Amino acid sequence: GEAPNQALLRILKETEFKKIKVLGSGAFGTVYKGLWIPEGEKVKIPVAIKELRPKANKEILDEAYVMASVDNPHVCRLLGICLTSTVQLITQLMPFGCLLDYVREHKDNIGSQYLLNWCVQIAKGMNYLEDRRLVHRDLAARNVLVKTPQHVKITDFGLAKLLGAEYHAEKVPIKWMALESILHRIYTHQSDVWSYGVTVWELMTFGSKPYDGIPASEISSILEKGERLPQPPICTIDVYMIMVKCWMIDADSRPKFRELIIEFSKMARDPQRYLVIQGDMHLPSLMDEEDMDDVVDADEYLIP
Numbered sequence: 686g687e688a689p690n691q692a693l694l695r696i697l698k699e700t701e702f703k704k705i706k707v708l709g710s711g712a713f714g715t716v717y718k719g720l721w722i723p724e725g726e727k728v729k730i731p732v733a734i735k736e737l738r739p740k741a742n743k744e745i746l747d748e749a750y751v752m753a754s755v756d757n758p759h760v761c762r763l764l765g766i767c768l769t770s771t772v773q774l775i776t777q778l779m780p781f782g783c784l785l786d787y788v789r790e791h792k793d794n795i796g797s798q799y800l801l802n803w804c805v806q807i808a809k810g811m812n813y814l815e816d817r818r819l820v821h822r823d824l825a826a827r828n829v830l831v832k833t834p835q836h837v838k839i840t841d842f843g844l845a846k847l848l849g850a851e852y853h854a855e856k857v858p859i860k861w862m863a864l865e866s867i868l869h870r871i872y873t874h875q876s877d878v879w880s881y882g883v884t885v886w887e888l889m890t891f892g893s894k895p896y897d898g899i900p901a902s903e904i905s906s907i908l909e910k911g912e913r914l915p916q917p918p919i920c921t922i923d924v925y926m927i928m929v930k931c932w933m934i935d936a937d938s939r940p941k942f943r944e945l946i947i948e949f950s951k952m953a954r955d956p957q958r959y960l961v962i963q964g965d966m967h968l969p970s971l972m973d974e975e976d977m978d979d980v981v982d983a984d985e986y987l988i989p
């Protein structure tokens with residue numbers, strides 16, 4: 686009852702692309718921003734390149750496996766790998782970085798229409814991961830990337846695990862995890878809903894750290910004690926009551942991603958009835974460095 690994963694893994698010559706600037710250095714590797722210029726095709730494709738540095742290659746290649754198996758407007762997909770001495774993952778460049786940082790660097794210009802539309806898009810992406818039976822296990826506003834202020838995508842599948850047709854792990858992010866995942870290291874699609882709740886909360890609070898100033902070990906108890914994160918100031922009880930349901934302890938009485946889409950979509954139809962924000966404002970649109978006449982976004986570059 687398990688279908689054959691016929692995704693293509695595309696191997697790309699290191700010649701076809703040019704690094705341009707370090708986006709980040711995490712010791713395991715370095716992520717560059719560059720251009721991908723396929724050979725004799727007259728397109729430049731803005732990309733991010735992550736090269737490892739180990740026996741950590743099993744990790745970077747597992748991520749490429751996941752990222753090559755996902756095709757959705759609200760998930761990041763792998764463009765290809767390059768098998769140089771350093772193995773390199775290539776993906777679409779998300780020009781505006783992660784949502785977490787974006788929400789902080791722009792609090793004074795983020796309206797309710799944006800916040801609620803983001804909540805819909807993350808839910809759509811997560812629901813699609815559900816369809817493909819994938820459990821993210823690391824949903825957080827920092828693992829949501831911003832292609833335009835109007836358009837975000839879920840990212841970071843390092844931890845991600847494909848279920849069959851209830852994943853048992855054994856380094857984690859505790860403040861975003863369902864109770865089950867703390868105590869039993871179980872991860873479900875409903876485990877992802879809990880983390881989704883925390884992510885919505887990050888966005889409403891414009892990037893506050895969940896349980897700031899609390900030591901991680903205590904968190905399991907205070908959650909069993911019936912405690913949760915505070916109602917955000919911009920948040921009507923309508924919004925916050927959705928957040929709170931994501932944090933119920935019976936994981937099956939939590940909401941499904943397809944329901945979070947409907948609910949937040951209904952709210953995004955009348956944003957100011959649901960989020961109260963002083964002065965509901967506008968947000969930006971990018972050639973940057975090199976002659977850019979033939980630049981094509983990854984989402985418009987489809988070799989089948």
Ligand SMILES: *CCC(=O)Nc1cccc(N(C(=O)OCc2ccc(F)cc2)c2ccnc(Nc3ccn(C)n3)n2)c1
Pocket residue numbers: 708709716733734735752763764774775776777778779780781782783784785786826827828830
């Ligand atoms: C909110 C947390 C955060 O800042 N994350 C962050 C910082 C810097 C760079 C990125 N990446 C990234 O992690 O990509 C890794 C990767 C995985 C798989 C693959 F095939 C290639 C690369 C990232 C990815 C895509 N686009 C951007 N863009 C970006 C980031 C910061 N700025 C200004 N632009 N980053 C994530």
